[PDB]
C-alpha cells in the first residue's frame, strides 16, 4: 500500500529552515530514517545539500558529499 509520513518536531524545523533563503532561490536536502512500508514512516535527521548549476535536479545529488555525510552522521548513531 501507500506510506504515511510522520515528521517529528526535529525534522520539520530543519527541512523548513534550509529552504527559507530567498523566494526565487531553490535548494535541496537529504532525509534519513529507519522504518518499514505498510503505513508507518519516520525521519531521524536531515541536512541540506549543495546546489549545482542545474539547481534542483537529479544530477544535483553528490555521491561524494552524501558519502562523507553518512560517515560523519555515524558518530551520533543517526546514520540510516
Amino acid at each position: 500500500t501507500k506510506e504515511t509520513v510522520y515528521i517529528s518536531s526535529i525534522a520539520l524545523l530543519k527541512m523548513l529552515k534550509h529552504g527559507r533563503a530567498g523566494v526565487p532561490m531553490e535548494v535541496m536536502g537529504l532525509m534519513l530514517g529507519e522504518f518499514v512500508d505498510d503505513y508507518t514512516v519516520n525521519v531521524v535527521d536531515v541536512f541540506a545539500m549543495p546546489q549545482s548549476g542545474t539547481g534542483v535536479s537529479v544530477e544535483a545529488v553528490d555521491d561524494v558529499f552524501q558519502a562523507k555525510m553518512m560517515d560523519m552522521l555515524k558518530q551520533t548513531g543517526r546514520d540510516q
Binding site: 518536531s9 526535529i10 524545523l13 530543519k14 523548513l16 529552515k17 534550509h18 527559507r20 535527521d45 541536512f47 541540506a48 545539500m49 549543495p50 558529499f65 562523507k68 555525510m69 560517515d71 560523519m72 558518530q75 551520533t76 548513531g77 543517526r78
Partner: protein, 157 residues
C-alpha cells in the same frame, strides 16, 4: 558583558542526540555550536553532537576527536557560508577537568571566545535548560551571560 540568543531548534536537536547515543549518567555529551560571534549578541544557528567519551570516576579520562570537526566544517561550507564555529556546548551539570581542558582545543578552530553551555538533559528546575557561560581569566572563571530564546518568523510560527 555580552548577550547570547539560542534558537529553540538548537536545544531541541541537542537533547535527542543524548538519546541517540544512549549516554548514561556515567558519561556526558559534548558538541559544537555554529553562528555569528562578531556582534555583541552571540547567536547559535547550528549545532552537532560529538562522540565524547568520559569516565566519571576519573577526571583525567576524556576522549575528543578533532578529525570529525575538520570534515564537518568543510561539509557546512557547501550548506551555509555564513555559519562558522563560535564555540562548543556540553551536557551534564558538573564542570570537571574533562570540560576545562577541552575548552582550549576548540579555541584553535574558533576565532573569538568559545561560548560554554551547560545543557540539562533532565530539565531540572525553573526554565532555561541551558545556560550561557563565557570563559575569562583573572584559574578558569566562567561568568554567566543573559540567555534569551528567539527564533525567526517562520520558526516561531
Amino acid at each position: 558583558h555580552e548577550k547570547v540568543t539560542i534558537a529553540p531548534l538548537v536545544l531541541l536537536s541537542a537533547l535527542d542526540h543524548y538519546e541517540r547515543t544512549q549516554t548514561k549518567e556515567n558519561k556526558r555529551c559534548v558538541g559544537v555550536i555554529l553562528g555569528d560571534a562578531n556582534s555583541s549578541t552571540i547567536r547559535v544557528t547550528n549545532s552537532f553532537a560529538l562522540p565524547f567519551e568520559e569516565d566519571e570516576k576519573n577526571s583525567d579520562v576524556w576522549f575528543l576527536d578533532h578529525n570529525y570537526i575538520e570534515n564537518m566544517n568543510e561539509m557546512c561550507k557547501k550548506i551555509n557560508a555564513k555559519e562558522k564555529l563560535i564555540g562548543w556546548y556540553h551536557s551534564g551539570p558538573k564542570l570537571r577537568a574533562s570540560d576545562l581542558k577541552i575548552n582550549e582545543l576548540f579555541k584553535k578552530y574558533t576565532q573569538n571566545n568559545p561560548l560554554l553551555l551547560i545543557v540539562d538533559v533532565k530539565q531540572q528546575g525553573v526554565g532555561l535548560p541551558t545556560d550561557a557561560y563565557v570563559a575569562i581569566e583573572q584559574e578558569k572563571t566562567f561568568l554567566h551571560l543573559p540567555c534569551t530564546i528567539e527564533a525567526e518568523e517562520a520558526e516561531e510560527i
